[model samples]
Target chain A: SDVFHLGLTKNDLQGAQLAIVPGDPERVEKIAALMDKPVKLASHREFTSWRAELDGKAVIVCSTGIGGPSTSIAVEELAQLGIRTFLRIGTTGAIQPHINVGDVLVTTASVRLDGASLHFAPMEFPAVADFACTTALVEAAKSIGATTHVGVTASSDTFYPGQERYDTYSGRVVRRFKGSMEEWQAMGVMNYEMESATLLTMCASQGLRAGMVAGVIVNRTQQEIPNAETMKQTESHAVKIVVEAARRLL
Target chain B: SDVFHLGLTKNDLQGAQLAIVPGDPERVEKIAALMDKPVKLASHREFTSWRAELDGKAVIVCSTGIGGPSTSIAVEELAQLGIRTFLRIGTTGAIQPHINVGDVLVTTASVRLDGASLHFAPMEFPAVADFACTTALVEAAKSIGATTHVGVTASSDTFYPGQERYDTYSGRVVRRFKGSMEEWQAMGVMNYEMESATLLTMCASQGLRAGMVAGVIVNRTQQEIPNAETMKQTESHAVKIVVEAARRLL
Candidate 1:
């Protein structure tokens, strides 16, 4: 019934409208655990799909690997499966100074710093989140009593050197990776991640709704101790917000 | 003596200031023929260097190949050889309506439509021609009495699909290619070529001076006409103007 080559029949995705996309397959299990009567629908390499009832609304969760290329493919395949509303529930490094380790950063827009999005649209094309999705995410975050920052996020291809960390292999690091965070922070970028730009761009191009709710795992702008427990709590809290927002969409 | 990679001793580039860069090695020979007395200095793969006395000024001409990656290397090597002022002398396809065959399109700035320049600076960095070089090009055009249009030039990777032309091999063509040219024309891009953006960006990053002066050989916005006579005359006139501009600079 659809153009997806994934071998899954159309009935497999029936009644699924809202989807939560995490980068890790294990996160899909964690997300599904929060829902009532979770059932595994599909499990592929790095893409473990699950569906459950959240507040009596049908919701699905899937993993979209590491970066833009693979994430874009997941979005494209899911789009064919009648998944309309997508929320990227992931972790991000804080670019802004005020964002703490436990804060959730809701992406309003993403800087198209990645190369994959250019194949879909021009460099001038804005990787803007859906307004309705963004508003819902903000409202959901407020309801859950979570401190959140809403602004742009910069995505990159290189994780280490691109993020301004010294590489042990080459012994040369790009100073601008950290410097860009400061510049973007000065211009109001709240976080830095790798997949939001592609997710937003693909959703926009395909006329679907998409947004991102990322927990601040690392604060690159400030030399502060990263609280791993606090970060996990923040991520779990953001995932619940996404689930609740998906339920509200029905 | 300065850099072994370029194979040019310090004494060889003593009075070289104004330089003309062509993409084809044979075109360098054609450019040198327009000068009063041209002597070959260094000839490398796709890079034919010559020293000529143009209007009693010491001028060096070199060739840069067809794409940004190779063109960037040419600029870096030339910059190391103590060459400051650079003008890309070549042919281009007109994107604007007013540009006609045999007209010279002087570049003001270039749209960073190429990928190689991103390695040196951020995409937001302007590929702008130095004001002095730009004024010289304008003056040279006026003195030569050739019809000229000055504005942004769109640079791309491939000549066929990249420039939005039909492909005979795959029997597939993108209609958006024409739409892109129209959009650029509306945004003030006078023509489309391959190398100007790389040259300008390298110059800006290296703190050198660079610009472009291209003869309109094809009017892609209209129809393609293979006029050997008009093309030859256009190239000759453009070379004469650049040589005179070099004289004024020295």
Candidate 2:
């Protein structure tokens, strides 16, 4: 009863107050594996979830698919299941020059470029992460010995033009979007991904606490693509940091 | 005898009131050929220029190399050489989805992400093209039967990350530059190029007229890279429009 896109009821959450959302449904199991007695609770369209325990506190790891539209659905359905705090763990492309690959970013806020967020709140409304949750994430990265950059993120809809990539199938960007990277870099933005804006905005609207930590897999400054080995290591490192943050939050 | 980067004195300009600036030195002779009795005027360090006549009025075609730094120098030196109006003709990457390769864009203004422009004017100062010159180019494009889109262009210092291209050596972007394209596209920007902002800004600051017309070589919406044939055709079309605009201005 009372299930939505997450395909789970309150009975399934085991009174968990925190949920870790990742964009990849496949990554759900790996992230869940970082906790104790993690078990697959539900699997639906791009929404695979696992229930686990972090320092005796029930935690849920769920997949929110690729962009803001799907992420909003995940957040809404989970909120209805009594999850009040959300931490999104995902990958990001760094927009600042000095940020290194495999580094962690504790997203204090997100630029509301993700279109789905606008449906929840007006553009002036901030898509900010929960303060305590952000602090926990920042400290967790430090405790885990991962280099952490704490700042703003830009959540986008299309992975290519939305992020201003030229190597797409078209190898061109719109005239309006020219020099956007330079402007964002000048504005001190942190990274680009697909989901956090919606997660933060929707949660804030419902008075739910939300935070995000992302693995810097690609550095847009150098146009750096992470190698397979490096990507795995960064993912592992990110999961460890998020799991540690979950313990601190608990 | 006022010579700077273009390595030309006022004598070489032959009291020309209008100049056409292109980014590539090799393009100088070709653009000048469109005028009557074109002749090489000067060449120095990525700045090659040619003297020609349109409608019996002397015209100068100069190359400003790749980006804003060199482009500003060309504009400055040309202005001192009695060149009162400037028109930049170059290639562009379309940011909007509807823009097609081989289309033309008359730049009425520029988003001053170009760092060199900041040296000429403060950030609040607009990087706007001369309205008369812009109208001349727009009419010329229509007269030339070129598919024309007119509005704004984002001019940058760096061709890669400054334009938000992910296809650099590193295949990544900085954290600060995320989601820039969507915002610019939403703002109705037209294209991305390297030099327009500097030309427009420096000219406007000196109370000189300036405008730019670009050939759409790539459409970033589909990330479409024009074939060599399409690129050449577009470049030729752009030159025709600029030359026609020069006649109209006179």
Candidate 3:
């Protein structure tokens, strides 16, 4: 197969079995820099690629753009290249009161609030991360002295209404999701992101392993987004944790 | 505050914190027998109750009829009685080729195909079992020398088309669920049951722990329902595992 969307073939992967996905094309360079002899690869619309090495093993660090739609495409194209493990590193908004900006969250499972994953499987299917991968991420984060919370994440289609955020220009949540944020918190959901449910569900259906680690850049309960300095610091810490987890997996 | 449907009040629960729920009213007697000094408490509609002691801790054994609606009610009523944990033991039909009839399935999570859980939370909310409860169930099943499969289960609202079973008198599945069974099998879902999604989601929303173990009475892939002796044996094994899991939790 050509692997159209990613603009790469199995030759680009070089027998790599692991992929570290981020949601922004720009972050690909920085994340790939953490590996050995990293070099940029193809750049398609919303899909960017970089080939790197970790512990003598080739790894692909690709960008999946924003939401589940683009994210699902990245997974599908990557799996065709024989990649069997996926790790998503991204940013998130904390919904629980105890979680703070600059903290990390290791996702165990996700609430399938995204539409893209539904195409692959029905609503009754769970979006759960591989147990070993989840455990590895948690241990790696803790070893680096990062404050971490492990729990379920709500992966939404729309950052505004789907997340029950009233800070948007409309300043209103639809009737169905009027109390969605509070309901998620009451149910002990750790954070809100846009891709984990899609990533996890797709990987599970394909018999691949997948996990995610996100840095909390905004604490929703506090109604405050962190300054750029704090956000960068957290992202850097998350990148380090992800690399360590990859090494542990190897 | 009268506790309308369950026909019991706080006094009847005797401050029990854990509950073992099954779908059949007739099974309550046999299940309660595994505990100390089991006695019948109430029988209202499809809800039946028995009070017993486990490790000197009061426990409630209740019947939730069938499907999500009654299961949700059982959870709601039990929570009002101060029960903090719930365990569902029931029968299921296997959908995967490797799963055999009479195998015990320890559900780590469920696909939310049940309408009862929707009222408690939205579709994005995951129907995941409590980790401690799930781990305990897995260990208990293994210790009993039973063939245990720990994976996801599909909890549906209907026994026919909802599970994609075309063996009914109508002999057809709806358009929406036309290939549902095949998809579930491909996603590695172990079995089909009716109440775990509702039970788990409702408990999660109310800040409680919930888990489930089901005996596979029919293998849909093979198109055969186990004979009475095999069904009884599997159900009996499930009952013992649930009791041991409760003890482990205590």
Winner of 1 and 3 under TM-score: 3
Q: What i-RMS does each candidate reach, in Å? A: 11.6, 19.2, 1.8
For model 3, how does the per-residue alpha-carbon lDDT over B24-121 read when each residue is reduced to its tens digit? 88898788899998978999898899998889988899899888888878888888898888988887777788888768888867888778888887
Please report, in order, the local distance difference test score of every candidate based on alpha carbons.
Answer: 0.71, 0.77, 0.82
In model 1, the runs with Cα more than 4 Å from the true position are A1-7, A171-178, B1-250
Clash counts for the predictions, in order: 1, 41, 1
Real interface contacts reproduced by model 1, as a fraction? 0.00
lDDT of 2 by residue, A104-188 (tens): 9999898765434655566788999999999999999999788899988877544444567665323444444556677788889
TM-score of each: 0.51, 0.50, 0.83
Ranking by DockQ: 3, 1, 2
Regarding lDDT, does 1 or 3 come out ahead? Answer: 3
* TM-score (second chain) of model 2: 0.94
> What is the RMSD of candidate 3?
3.8
The prediction achieving the highest DockQ against the true structure is: 3
Error of 3 at B142 (Å): 4.0
Scoring only the A-chain of each prediction against the true A-chain gives TM-scores of 0.91, 0.95, 0.96
The candidate, 1 or 3, that scores higher on DockQ is 3
